[PDB]
Amino acid sequence: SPQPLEQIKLSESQLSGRVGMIEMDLASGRTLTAWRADERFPMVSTFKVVLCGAVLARVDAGDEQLERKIHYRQQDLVDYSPVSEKHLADGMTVGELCAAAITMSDNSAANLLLATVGGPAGLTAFLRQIGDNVTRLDRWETELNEALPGDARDTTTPASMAATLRKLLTSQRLSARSQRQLLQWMVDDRVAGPLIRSVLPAGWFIADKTGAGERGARGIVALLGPNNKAERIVVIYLRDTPASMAERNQQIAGIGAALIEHWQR
Numbered sequence: 001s002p003q004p005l006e007q008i009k010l011s012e013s014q015l016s017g018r019v020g021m022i023e024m025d026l027a028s029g030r031t032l033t034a035w036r037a038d039e040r041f042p043m044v045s046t047f048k049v050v051l052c053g054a055v056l057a058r059v060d061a062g063d064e065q066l067e068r069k070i071h072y073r074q075q076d077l078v079d080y081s082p083v084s085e086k087h088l089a090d091g092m093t094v095g096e097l098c099a100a101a102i103t104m105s106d107n108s109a110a111n112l113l114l115a116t117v118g119g120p121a122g123l124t125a126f127l128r129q130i131g132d133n134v135t136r137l138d139r140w141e142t143e144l145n146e147a148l149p150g151d152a153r154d155t156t157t158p159a160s161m162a163a164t165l166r167k168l169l170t171s172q173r174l175s176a177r178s179q180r181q182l183l184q185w186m187v188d189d190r191v192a193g194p195l196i197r198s199v200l201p202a203g204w205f206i207a208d209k210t211g212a213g214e215r216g217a218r219g220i221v222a223l224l225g226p227n228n229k230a231e232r233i234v235v236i237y238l239r240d241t242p243a244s245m246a247e248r249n250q251q252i253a254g255i256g257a258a259l260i261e262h263w264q265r
């Protein structure tokens with residue numbers, strides 16, 4: 001594999017789309033690689049990690065409990081609800097809803113949680129409270145994946161998202177138990193985690209949340225490192241590419257391969 005920046009460039013050439021990428025030390029926030037890091041990209045399903053950070057912040061303040069059972073109706077369900085469609089009779093706890101949203105990208109689970117934090121506006125207000133003045137959620141699932149060209153709704157930047165995930169996982173804004181829970185939800189991703197592990201060399205840690213939307217939109221927020229440690233946050237977004245989902249996956253994986261082959265920077 002070429003150097004990380006060279007591979008990122010090669011990925012834009014091949015996809016005919018924009019890639020945005022930050023690689024950041026988790027413990028310190030050192031930025032190692034930055035490409036289009038201040039440009040906007042649709043968050044797609046990656047927003048669900050920030051969503052559950054807002055939920056945890058409410059838990060820490062005594063305004064929410066992960067145990068609290070939420071009951072909902074079939075009319076509340078939106079497209080792709082693999083866990084939530086099973087619990088119309090018995091409901092789901094707030095914590096179960098976060099696990100379904102993060103580890104299965106259950107869309108109805110995400111909307112149920114979004115309601116509890118004040119909707120898209122509430123989540124954006126939370127972002128501002130933690131010092132992210134750029135990321136914005138405007139819509140609910142699944143309209144937030146529309147990724148129209150030039151539309152600022154439902155976007156982040158690679159630098160903002162990386163700084164925000166660092167803040168949620170490590171800055172002690174959340175309690176120790178809350179930080180540990182958000183991390184464990186990412187470790188438990190069933191959508192992409194096992195697949196990523198199957199192609200990672202032995203010894204590499206992965207935790208992640210991925211997303212996809214229209215017009216080629218794709219995202220991953222991840223923790224990655226050798227020696228089974230969550231050494232770095234890696235955020236990669238793609239937008240405005242006509243490429244197959246397989247090719248977008250292959251290009252993201254190629255960026256990961258360049259990081260692995262040239263880790264010591």
Ligand SMILES: OC[C@H]1O[C@H](O[C@H]2[C@H](O)[C@@H](O)[C@H](OCCCCCCC3CCCCC3)O[C@@H]2CO)[C@H](O)[C@@H](O)[C@@H]1O
Pocket residue numbers: 001196199200201206220221222223224234235236252253254255256257258260261
């Ligand atoms: O010398 C480094 C390594 O080089 C290869 O590993 C390859 C591996 O066989 C391939 O499967 C992977 O694909 C990359 C898979 C990455 C998966 C997605 C990464 C995510 C994670 C973080 C967010 C961005 C993307 O690349 C590595 C590095 O070339 C060898 O197979 C392995 O024995 C050796 O230890």
